[PDB]
Design a binder for these strands. Structure first.
Length: 621
DNA sequence: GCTGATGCGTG
DNA sequence: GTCGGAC
DNA sequence: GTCCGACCACGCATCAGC
């Protein structure tokens, strides 16, 4: 019966076309039949609709199962502030699949571990979700063998395509072409066509029957926006879905409101090609340029009562990471400030030298540090936006209003709390001077944001309303030494390449980084046909990769390619220019990207390791 | 008790 | 984080 | 333009195997 569930049929009847009786639990084969339908198409509009159909039947037949199927669709375990980690990777999964042959026999890997995984009672969407959370809670000695027993049990109770999606979910890559934005769209459409909370049989099955083409289309877009904006204020399905089922989507904003202590999605940013693009994109609109600091974003929450909370860009609870900010919280606020959401950037600060350390020094800090004195790498917050002030939300306020509120209610404590360096002007000469000074002041670039025109703190309108003017968006010449196999959208062809530089004194090619972005499918096919006969079974003696990942296809060094990167970093695993700067660490590329092939050059004529050292030395650090 | 492997988050 | 693909 | 999934380096935290 559930083998024939087709949530992609025309005139889908949520009750008759369902595959489970009302009041019963949604079987996992139902959501697995839906997944197979979503991955068989490419248009998101047909993806959002096929999902949405399953969400109708769930809202009508088994309401309490809605939250589990949404998370199973999102491939998540709950709200990000919780932090439940699966702790299961490819190795753990392969072991569980064999216990249902041999680990070497299961080492086929197509690309996709689900295909390799392909009497008990049938599986349940809630039961599978509770088993996923059980796996996540398993910690301590022999916790792995406990996880593998649970996973082993799932694969035995799997049927049809259940084995390929359970394995995909646990591996962390469902690869459905459907993510959070379409899941919300499918949910908003679902509850608008089938309202929740109807006595069975539901008096309304399809609330878009008596509407025109423009009517339903415009209606569903307005309904989706009410849900999308509220999610951006409360990204917590455990907090939205109970309210959604109780009071409809129309009343959802009246209860799920932007509150301190509950994280909210921050304003993203889109890269600007140059000053010409930011001037054209912000035509006749005022624009302020700030210094994009190179650190980790800190969302400082000040709940009414004194409890301080700190979240990350992805709503991860970072309170235990910054006890110093939890202590210095009152030093940055004014007496009238009773509750506030500060949008700051946490960068490493050397209190002795009064300078900002690079990003790597920030990452050497402890994640769960109960000892405040044991914190060596100090931090200084750079506040650049305010989203809340004394019981009031500032989402619908322009940037000029939020800026004047931050500057008039927060004290600049030099060395620990300083406002971001800003410059409000339109002269192309002043913009270049501020851009050159930002790199001179140890910053990655310049942020460009409006002050009044489309300058509110609203994600659903445009999550990428801010502009990023980084210097690398305005290069090295390295040889290939090997190729890697592709996974997912890269199966059957090449996925990443390992590049190397030429050490003149050592007379050996030294691996400097891997390269897996910046090329089209036609260029990747041109790379395959060109670097095909160069396949070598063993590495050449002049090649040296040190601790880098051994390429699946050793290549005869003969291809010189141009690679651009953001920064040069000291590498713990690469041998490029080891000893030239650090005694035991080489040099690698931050954010590498492929540019073009240099057919005019040979491996001998490429970026030397001595050059890589000089480039790293002339890097403001 | 330690270490290598690795999961997973940060960009 | 950067990037291209499909729509 | 949006949304999504390819891919990059690197750091802490965890744990099986020893």
């Amino acid at each position: 019966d559930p083998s024939g569930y087709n949530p992609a049929k025309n005139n889908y009847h949520p009750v008759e076309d369902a595959c489970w009786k009302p009041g019963q639990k949604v079987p996992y084969l139902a959501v697995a039949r839906t997944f197979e339908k979503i991955e068989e198409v490419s248009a998101r509009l047909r993806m959002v609709e096929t999902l949405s159909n399953l969400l109708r039947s769930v809202v009508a037949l088994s309401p309490p199962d809605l939250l589990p199927v949404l998370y199973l669709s999102l491939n998540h375990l709950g709200p990000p502030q919780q932090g439940l980690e699966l702790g299961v990777g490819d190795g753990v999964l392969l072991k569980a699949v064999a216990q249902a042959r041999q680990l070497e026999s299961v080492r086929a890997e197509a690309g996709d571990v689900g295909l390799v995984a392909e009497p008990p009672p049938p599986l349940t969407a809630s039961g599978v979700f509770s088993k996923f959370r059980d796996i996540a809670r398993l910690t301590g000695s022999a916790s792995t063998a406990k996880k593998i027993d649970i996973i082993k049990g799932l694969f035995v109770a799997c049927r049809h395509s259940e084995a390929r999606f359970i394995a995909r979910s646990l591996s962390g890559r469902l690869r459905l072409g459907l993510a959070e934005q379409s899941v919300l769209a499918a949910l908003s459409q679902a509850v608008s066509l089938t309202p929740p909370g109807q006595e069975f049989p539901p008096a309304m099955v399809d609330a878009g029957k008596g509407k025109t083409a423009e009517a339903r289309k415009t209606w569903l877009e307005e309904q989706g926006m009410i849900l999308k904006q509220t999610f951006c204020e409360v990204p917590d399905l455990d907090r939205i879905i109970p309210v959604l089922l109780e009071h409809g989507l129309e009343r959802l904003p009246e209860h799920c409101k932007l509150s301190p202590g509950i994280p909210l999605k921050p304003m993203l940013a889109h890269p600007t090609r140059g000053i010409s693009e930011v001037l054209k994109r912000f035509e006749e609109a005022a624009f302020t340029c700030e210094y994009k600091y190179d650190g980790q974003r800190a969302q400082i929450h000040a709940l009414e009562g004194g409890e301080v909370k700190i979240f990350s860009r992805n709503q991860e609870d970072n309170t235990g990471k910054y006890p110093d900010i939890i202590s210095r919280i009152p030093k940055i606020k004014l007496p009238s400030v009773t509750s506030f959401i500060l949008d700051t950037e946490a960068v490493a600060w050397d209190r002795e030298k009064k300078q900002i350390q690079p990003f790597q020094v920030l990452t050497t800090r402890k994640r769960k540090e109960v000892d405040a004195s044991e914190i060596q790498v100090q931090v200084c917050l750079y506040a650049f936006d305010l989203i809340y002030l004394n019981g009031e939300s500032l989402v619908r306020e322009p940037l000029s209003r939020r800026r004047q509120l931050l500057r008039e209610n927060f004290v600049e404590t030099e060395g620990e709390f300083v406002f971001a360096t800003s410059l409000d002007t339109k002269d192309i000469e002043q913009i270049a001077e501020f851009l050159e000074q930002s790199v001179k002041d140890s910053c990655e670039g310049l942020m460009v944001k409006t002050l009044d025109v489309d300058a509110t703190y609203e994600i659903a309108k445009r999550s990428h309303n801010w502009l990023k003017l980084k210097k690398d968006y305005l290069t090295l010449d390295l040889v290939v030494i090997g190729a890697y196999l592709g996974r997912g959208k890269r199966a059957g062809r090449y996925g990443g390449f390992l590049l190397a530089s030429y050490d003149e004194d050592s007379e050996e090619l030294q691996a400097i980084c891997k390269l897996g972005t910046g090329f089209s499918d036609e260029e990747l096919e041109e790379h395959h046909q060109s670097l095909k006969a160069l396949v070598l079974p063993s590495p050449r003696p002049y090649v040296r990769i040190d601790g880098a990942v051994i390429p699946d296809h050793w290549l005869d060094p003969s291809a010189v390619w141009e690679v651009k990167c953001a920064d040069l970093s000291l590498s713990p695993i690469y041998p490029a220019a080891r000893g030239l700067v650090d005694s035991d660490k080489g040099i690698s590329l931050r954010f590498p990207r492929f540019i073009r092939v240099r057919e005019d050059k040979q491996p001998e004529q490429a970026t030397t390791s001595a050059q890589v050292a000089c480039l790293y030395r002339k890097q403001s650090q």
